Ligand binder design. Structure first.
Ligand SMILES: OC[C@H]1O[C@@H](O[C@@H]2[C@@H](O)[C@H](O[C@@H]3[C@@H](O)[C@H](O[C@@H]4[C@@H](O)[C@H](O[C@@H]5[C@@H](O)[C@H](O[C@@H]6[C@@H](O)[C@H](O)O[C@H](CO)[C@H]6O)O[C@H](CO)[C@H]5O)O[C@H](CO)[C@H]4O)O[C@H](CO)[C@H]3O)O[C@H](CO)[C@H]2O)[C@H](O)[C@@H](O)[C@@H]1O
Length: 101
């Protein structure tokens, strides 16, 4: 049965974090994440935000001010509502390996 799609994360040059999932017929996408500190289960995170509509096919979370560095780790989990039911990407871990213009 259904599983949340994996998120794509990008570090932006000169600054910023962008996180997105494809719209698979959701009503809601939430991102919950911490920088260089593990998530202790389903805690809110330093980044914690509900996104309520997709934009051109994707659900997008942005922190335009996040100044990331190579080797920074983001520990995260996401939440999507599909047909009134909730699904998570659990135990997300992403390492900055480069930047996007
Ligand atoms: O009303 C004024 C008040 O408003 C507040 O804002 C609200 C805001 O917080 C809310 O945001 C949504 C957010 O809560 C939601 O998070 C969910 C989270 O609820 C969920 O937690 C689960 C528990 O549900 C679960 O409970 C179990 C229960 O299901 C079962 O029936 O019984 C069990 C007992 O036997 C019981 O434990 O327990 C587990 C732990 O085991 C919890 O993890 O977890 C999911 C993740 O899986 C999490 O996503 O997510 C939504 C979508 O992102 C958020 O939108 O939204 C409301 C509006 O819809 C707001 O009103 C303010 O903060 C206050 O200041 C205001 O006073």
């Amino acid at each position: 049965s259904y599983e949340a799609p994996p998120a794509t994360l990008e570090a932006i040059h000169p600054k910023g974090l962008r996180v997105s999932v494809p719209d698979e017929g959701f009503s809601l996408f939430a991102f919950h994440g911490k920088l260089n500190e593990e998530m202790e289960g389903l805690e809110a995170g330093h980044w914690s935000r509900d996104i309520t509509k997709p934009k051109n096919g994707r659900w997008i979370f942005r922190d335009r001010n996040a100044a990331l560095k190579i080797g920074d780790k983001i520990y995260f989990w996401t939440f999507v509502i599909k047909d009134g039911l909730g699904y998570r990407q659990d135990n997300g871990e992403w390492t900055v390996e480069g930047f996007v213009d």
